[PDB]
Write an enzyme that holds these catalytic residues in place. Structure first.
Site, PDB file in Angstrom:
ATOM      1  N   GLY A 106       2.031   6.452   8.641  1.00 12.64           N
ATOM      2  CA  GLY A 106       3.401   6.760   8.287  1.00 12.64           C
ATOM      3  C   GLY A 106       4.382   5.694   8.708  1.00 12.64           C
ATOM      4  N   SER A 160       3.687   2.484   8.105  1.00 20.07           N
ATOM      5  CA  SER A 160       3.436   1.379   7.187  1.00 20.07           C
ATOM      6  C   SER A 160       4.704   0.939   6.484  1.00 20.07           C
ATOM      7  CB  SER A 160       2.457   1.837   6.128  1.00 20.07           C
ATOM      8  OG  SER A 160       1.145   1.728   6.683  1.00 20.07           O
ATOM      9  N   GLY A 161       4.847  -0.373   6.361  1.00 19.26           N
ATOM     10  CA  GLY A 161       5.982  -0.957   5.703  1.00 19.26           C
ATOM     11  C   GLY A 161       7.202  -1.080   6.570  1.00 19.26           C
ATOM     12  N   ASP A 187       0.094  -7.695   1.848  1.00 18.86           N
ATOM     13  CA  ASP A 187       0.518  -6.296   1.764  1.00 18.86           C
ATOM     14  C   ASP A 187       2.039  -6.241   1.855  1.00 18.86           C
ATOM     15  OD1 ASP A 187       0.539  -3.566   1.723  1.00 18.86           O
ATOM     16  OD2 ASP A 187      -0.354  -3.336   3.726  1.00 18.86           O
ATOM     17  N   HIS A 223       0.809  -1.215   0.000  1.00 19.89           N
ATOM     18  CA  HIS A 223       0.000   0.000   0.000  1.00 19.89           C
ATOM     19  C   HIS A 223       0.846   1.272   0.000  1.00 19.89           C
ATOM     20  CE1 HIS A 223       0.099  -0.381   4.555  1.00 19.89           C
ATOM     21  NE2 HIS A 223       0.339   0.907   4.376  1.00 19.89           N
TER      22      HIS A 223
END
Length: 222
Positions: free
Chosen positions: A174, A176-177, A85, A41
């Site tokens: 922020g 994410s990942g 994801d 995402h």
């Protein structure tokens, strides 16, 4: 991430910052000198990766900047359900490894025994603002049944949940990942979770990295 604090300067050499248009978008994890793992995402055109960062606004001697030349979204990523994801970013050149820039080994065992973990990132903090200094918090894995109970019909085998019932330490916008690190291995990637951020009642949801060992290896050695 909410309810944590600034990380130790030397403890996150695998942390990547993903920027677009000069501003933080997501976190990521250096897993190979040429490759950063992150959430699907987080895909945007013109991604830039910063390695070796601690304070975002400081120009730091340890940092390295790299454009992303290839972004490989997992073929089974389902944006609507957030399933699978995960995305691999190929750096324009191999990162110059140092004490402050090092890959993090992947957890290959979905049954790994370490259940207490660290999360890291520059996402929104508890004040509702975005921090300059990278934040860290210690949280704990939640069983699939408990997490399924929290998000009925939304949890798959490609997801791992983690949180903190005492203070609600949790990832946030922020982050994410970025990494969920358990037993010094990459166990998860920040993916989704409650709104507002905070895990006292519902845990954060992370991409289950152990499910992707084959695909990661095949993509890197292609």
């Amino acid at each position: 991430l909410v309810h944590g604090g600034p990380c130790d300067k030397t403890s996150h050499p695998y942390q990547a910052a993903l920027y677009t248009s000069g501003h933080l978008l997501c976190g990521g994890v250096l897993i190979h000198p040429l490759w950063v793992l992150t959430a699907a995402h987080c895909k945007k055109p013109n991604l830039q990766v910063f390695l070796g960062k601690h304070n975002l606004g400081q120009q730091e001697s340890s940092q390295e900047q790299s454009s992303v030349v290839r972004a490989v979204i997992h073929p089974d990523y389902d944006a609507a359900s957030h399933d699978q994801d995960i995305m691999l970013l190929r750096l324009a050149r191999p990162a110059k490894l140092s004490e402050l820039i090092q890959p993090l080994p992947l957890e290959r065992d979905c049954s790994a025994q370490t259940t207490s973990c660290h999360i890291l990132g520059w996402g929104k903090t508890a004040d509702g603002d975005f921090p300059d200094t990278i934040q860290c918090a210690y949280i704990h894995l939640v069983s699939r049944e408990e997490c399924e109970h929290a998000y009925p019909g939304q949890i798959t085998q490609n997801m791992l949940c983690a949180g903190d019932e005492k203070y609600g330490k949790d990832s946030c916008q922020g982050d994410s990942g970025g990494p969920l690190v358990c037993g010094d291995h990459l166990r998860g990637l920040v993916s989704w979770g409650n709104i507002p951020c905070g895990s006292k009642e519902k845990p954060g949801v992370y991409t289950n990295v152990c499910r992707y060992t084959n695909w990661i290896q095949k993509t890197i050695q292609a």
